[PDB]
Amino acid sequence: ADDIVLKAKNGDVKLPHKAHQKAVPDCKKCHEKGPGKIEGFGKEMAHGKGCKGCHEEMKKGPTKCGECHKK
């Protein structure tokens, strides 16, 4: 399957799966979540544990605006 881009108005956000599969062997951080995770995602989650927060906790991955968002 293909990578997805989130159409944030300030700039597209790429989500490269290959890097995540390699760097996050605990697949259940994202997969086999209960129902509601597709509807639930948004800016609050993205800027929290959905994206940025995991990067902070794992000590790796982008944490600056322009590292995630790109027109």
DSSP for 7-35 reads --TTSEEEE-HHHHHHH---GGGTSS--T
20: annotated binding-site residue? yes
59: annotated binding-site residue? no
Work out how close the CB of 54 gets to ligand DXC at its nearest, in angstroms, rounded to a whole number: 8
Work out how close the CB of 36 gets to ligand HEC at its nearest, in angstroms, rounded to a whole number: 15
* CB-side neighbour CA atoms (13 Å) of 35: 0
9: annotated binding-site residue? yes
**Residue 6 per-residue DSSP state:** E
Positions in the binding site for ligand DXC (CB under 6 A): 4, 6, 15, 30, 33, 37-38, 40-41, 45, 49-50
